[PDB]
């Protein structure tokens, strides 16, 4: 019973982290890929975001 419970625990962990981490890390990657130190973007806005 305990072994099955731990298997379920870590399976749910891997599912949740796969999905949510992929989504969040892709969003962060896109945002950082748009970042530029040109004269047109506010440095404070970009770093704060």
């Amino acid at each position: 019973d305990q072994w099955a419970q731990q298997v379920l625990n870590y399976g749910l962990l891997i599912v949740l982290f796969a999905a949510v981490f992929g989504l969040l890390m892709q969003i962060f990657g896109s945002y950082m890929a748009d970042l530029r130190f040109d004269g047109a973007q506010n440095v404070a806005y970009a770093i704060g975001g």
Binding site: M32, D34, F37, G39, A40, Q41, V43, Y45, A46, G49
Partner: protein
């Protein structure tokens, strides 16, 4: 005549001395201008009038 020729030669060397002083002043001015351009670029990057930021899409 030779004395006056040598005097003119001294005047020419004086003129070169003045020219070298002028060149040194111009060198200093050029360095100051390069620094001014650097600071203009820095101000342009960090200006608070900028309104852009990355977009989430």
């Amino acid at each position: 005549e030779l004395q006056a020729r040598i005097a003119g030669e001294q005047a020419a060397i004086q003129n070169e001395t003045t020219k070298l002083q002028m060149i040194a002043q111009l060198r200093q001015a050029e360095q100051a201008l390069i620094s001014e351009q650097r600071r203009e670029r820095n101000m342009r990057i960090l200006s608070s009038g900028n309104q852009g930021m990355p977009t989430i899409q």
